[PDB]
């Protein structure tokens, strides 16, 4: 679950996840939160583990 700039679409979100984390993403679902920002649920493929890469980013 990421916070995303308001100008980004699902293509850009997917490409930038693949670049910044070297992860293949299955699908992206975005919404605009009531505070004015954008939230992206990024579901990865079954090969990668979001739990394994979240603490690699530095949060869990």
């Amino acid at each position: 679950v990421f916070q995303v700039s308001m100008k980004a679409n699902k293509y850009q979100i997917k490409k930038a996840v693949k670049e910044l984390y070297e992860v293949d993403v299955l699908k992206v679902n975005t919404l605009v939160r009531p505070n004015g920002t954008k939230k992206a649920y990024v579901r990865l493929t079954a090969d990668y583990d979001a739990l394994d890469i979240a603490n690699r980013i530095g949060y869990i």
Binding site: L20, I57, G58, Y59
Partner: protein, 119 residues
Amino acid sequence: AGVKAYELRTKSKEQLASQLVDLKKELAELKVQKLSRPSLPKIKTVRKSIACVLTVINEQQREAVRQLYKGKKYQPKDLRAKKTRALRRALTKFEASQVTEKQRKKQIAFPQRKYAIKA
């Protein structure tokens, strides 16, 4: 602390791009810590250093374009002077100083003489 513009000005554009992308990496790594810690004042130095690197890159590219367009008319509008719309539309010093040959003959023959009056 942060980066210094005078020591960044010595580098090439590729070193500047590498510096910029690792600075952005560190900005992301501090943004993921700002939610864990109460306060993180270190992020402002990285933000301003990114701003400085971008300023230096833009200045280097603009100077390259200026030296490309050096010594010729029709340089780009963002590079030529801004001053005001009215001053840009005003006559040049040459066009204002243009006079007819008749007025030039008259000014050469009868210029305003310098004279004083006591004796």
